[PDB]
């Protein structure tokens, strides 16, 4: 019973954790991409000049 | 001047070599950060 109870709780927590992680990852990725793009553009311009 | 142009080409190749070295260093730093996070998690689990 105790184990089951713990398991149940753990299960819920696990799910939540996963979701959170995913969200964070997504956000980070997006940000990174944007930054990279901007940088590239700037560099290109400079080079051209 | 032709020899200087050859040296400039060698310098341009060394620039790409340095860029590859910097990329490898960044990858190694990311791997070290991931390993440190995993080691902190394992240390917390071992303490518990």
């Amino acid at each position: 019973d105790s184990n089951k109870t713990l398991l149940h709780n753990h299960l819920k927590s696990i799910e939540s954790l996963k979701l959170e992680n995913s969200d964070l990852e997504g956000k980070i990725r997006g940000v990174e991409d944007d930054l990279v793009t901007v940088q590239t553009e700037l560099n290109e311009e400079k080079k051209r000049l | 001047r032709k020899e200087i142009k050859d040296r400039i080409s060698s310098c341009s190749s060394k620039e790409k070599t340095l860029v590859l070295e910097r990329r490898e260093l960044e990858g190694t730093r990311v791997s070290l950060e991931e390993r440190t996070k995993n080691l902190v998690s394992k240390m917390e689990k071992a303490e518990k």
Partner: protein, 49 residues
């Protein structure tokens, strides 16, 4: 597992130190190449003269 992870972390730190040394050597080579390019510009000015 923690001893294995500590050995892996020590190996990764040694690899990072080797990569930093290689980056410093590449920076020294780039400085030598900049000096060679300055000498090449001086030689080109001498050739124009």
């Amino acid at each position: 597992d923690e001893l294995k992870v500590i050995e892996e972390q020590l190996k990764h730190t040694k690899l990072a130190l080797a990569e930093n040394d290689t980056n410093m050597n590449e920076t020294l080579n780039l400085k030598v190449e900049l000096k060679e390019q300055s000498e090449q510009l001086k030689e080109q000015m001498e050739d124009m003269e």
